[PDB]
Amino acid sequence: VERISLEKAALEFSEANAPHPRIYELPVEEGRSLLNEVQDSPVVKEDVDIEDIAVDTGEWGEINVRFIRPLHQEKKLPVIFYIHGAGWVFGNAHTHDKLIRELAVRTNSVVVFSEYSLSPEAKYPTAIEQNYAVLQQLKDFANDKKFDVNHLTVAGDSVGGNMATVMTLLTKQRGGQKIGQQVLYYPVTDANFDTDSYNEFAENYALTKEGMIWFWDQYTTSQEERHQITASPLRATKEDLADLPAALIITGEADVLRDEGEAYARKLREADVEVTQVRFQAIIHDFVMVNSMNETHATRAAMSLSTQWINEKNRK
Amino acid sequence: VERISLEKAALEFSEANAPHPRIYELPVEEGRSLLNEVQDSPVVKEDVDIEDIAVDTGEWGEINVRFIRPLHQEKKLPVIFYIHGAGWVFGNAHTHDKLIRELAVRTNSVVVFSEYSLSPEAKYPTAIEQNYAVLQQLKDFANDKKFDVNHLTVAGDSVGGNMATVMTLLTKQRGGQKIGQQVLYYPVTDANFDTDSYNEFAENYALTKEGMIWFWDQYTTSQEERHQITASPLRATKEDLADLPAALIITGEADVLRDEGEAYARKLREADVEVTQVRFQAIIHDFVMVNSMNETHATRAAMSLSTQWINEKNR
């Protein structure tokens, strides 16, 4: 029961995820249902136009891609390619609904939300190849979905932050659709479970060290995989990271992933990438996604900073 | 020579302040001139209308208070009472010119800037009593200076953030002019020099543990005074802190004062005060004030977050 200072909704969400069996101790089908039920909880939602489109990723099959648009926009908007978190095992358009609607409206952008194949049914690198392939097709939707592919932000939370920063790496390496900038909400950057934040916040803050070990076990078959920079971008060299797009990296104080996210920000800064890195106090993992944490000072400030930072980038 | 990852301009500012004699080893007159010269360095400043008004604080004497207004504005604007940092010993309208012009123009506010008596010529609690007395005369200037006291933010950097929050303790204790919100940039909150941030960043990050000990020594050297909540607001109890105005507290990573800023945020939170606490990576002390740090990612994001937070509170 001894916690560091937390906002009330973060304490409450930490207590509601203390009991066993925990999400990661359930059969995956019950895990997915449980998070859908958490994200059934009441929240003020921005009103938007939604279209679901089947996209062909070539070798990695067909996935649903959801297009979010703010109401009554007559001009071509900037585009955010958004990659959802929840461990590679959970998540869909419903679990991240409030968050992508707020992004869409406050940045006056089209949000392209890829429903990539979840682990463990699909293994690394399916999801990152599926995401990179719908990125290379944004140009073919731009006209019909009234967005400008030249004003392209990639964004993600947790494992989506992981895969969003990895889209910039694949994009530089293979010469894909130019990404202007990247927004990473408490990303996964490394398969190391022994950072200072990983030990301090191991238990009692909803997401656990054991939770993260299990997610990664669902994600990879092996370990010569977790060393690859498209799995663990924290392992990239200064040369790998050179010329990558401008980054906004948001961490929570009470988060096992805090230190690897802050570590990654430093590597990008040391490779001369423009980096804005900001740690919100008294907040846990998943704080911009979870409906019940929507009115936290951390969620309000992180949403204001991220939308202002994206708006500034798009003004150009 | 070994430092954590810093933004280029923060590393440059840290290197420029490495030699002896330090600003705090100079006679105070020379330190004041040196910081004036640092803040002559080039910066694009927002355009404003400026009036300097001699205000009488009674017991603590007459000080200059600078009134800053955005151009071409006819309506009653909200007001920010801005208390400047630089250790109680340095600083003036010029050393903080870019920051207060940015705050005025981006919030479309009148900024009221008190040139309170500096230490060690003046001792605690003269500066806090002068600032409190100016807060109570805002109503007297509202009509001529076309602002609305009902939309009143108090803000300050470093010892200014110290004194801004103390403005909220005093206004509560004394029932003075109501303050809606407080913005604290990397505030001083306590006279303990052994926090982990005080020890990690003691040297090589421009502001030193040595410099902060010297600033405190110019202000008051009584342990009893340093322990009053009007000096070290971090010593405030839950009951002292209850019903205080909503707080934005901004810290930099590579700052001796980071830990006490972040601990003050916690105590407000525990008093059920509405607190937004945010730490910027790879930046030093004084990052929203110093002209050469103006284009830092930390400064741009801190000014965008603080200005929007103020606008959202006044709506």
Numbering used by the authors:
A (entry chain G): 2 to 317
B (entry chain A): 2 to 316
From the paper:
LgEstI belongs to the HSL family of α/β-hydrolases and presents a clear substrate preference for a short acyl chain and an acetate moiety that are suitable for the narrow entrance to the active site. Monomeric LgEstI exhibits a canonical α/β hydrolase fold with conserved key active site residues. The active site of LgEstI has the typical catalytic triad of esterases, identified as Ser159, Asp256, and His286, and is located at the bottom of the substrate access channel.
However, F207A exhibited a significantly increased hydrolytic activity (over 150%) toward pNA. To understand the increased activity of F207A against pNA at the molecular level, its structure was determined at a resolution of 2.1 Å. The overall structure of F207A was almost identical to that of wild-type LgEstI, with 0.177 of RMSD (Cα of monomer); in addition, the oligomerization form remained unchanged. However, Phe14 was shifted by approximately 0.5 Å due to the spatial reduction caused by the mutation of Phe207 to alanine. Phe14 in the wild-type protein interacted with Phe207 via edge-face interactions and was oriented toward the substrate access channel. The additional space created by the disappearance of Phe207 was partially occupied by Phe14. The pocket volume based on the molecular surface (MS) volume increased from 548.4 Å3 to 657.8 Å3 in the F207A structure. Therefore, area expansion could increase substrate accessibility and/or dissociation of the product, thereby increasing enzyme activity. The F207 mutation increased activity against pNA; however, F207A did not exhibit increased activity against other substrates with long acyl chains in parallel, when compared to LgEstI, indicating that other factors could be involved in substrate selectivity.
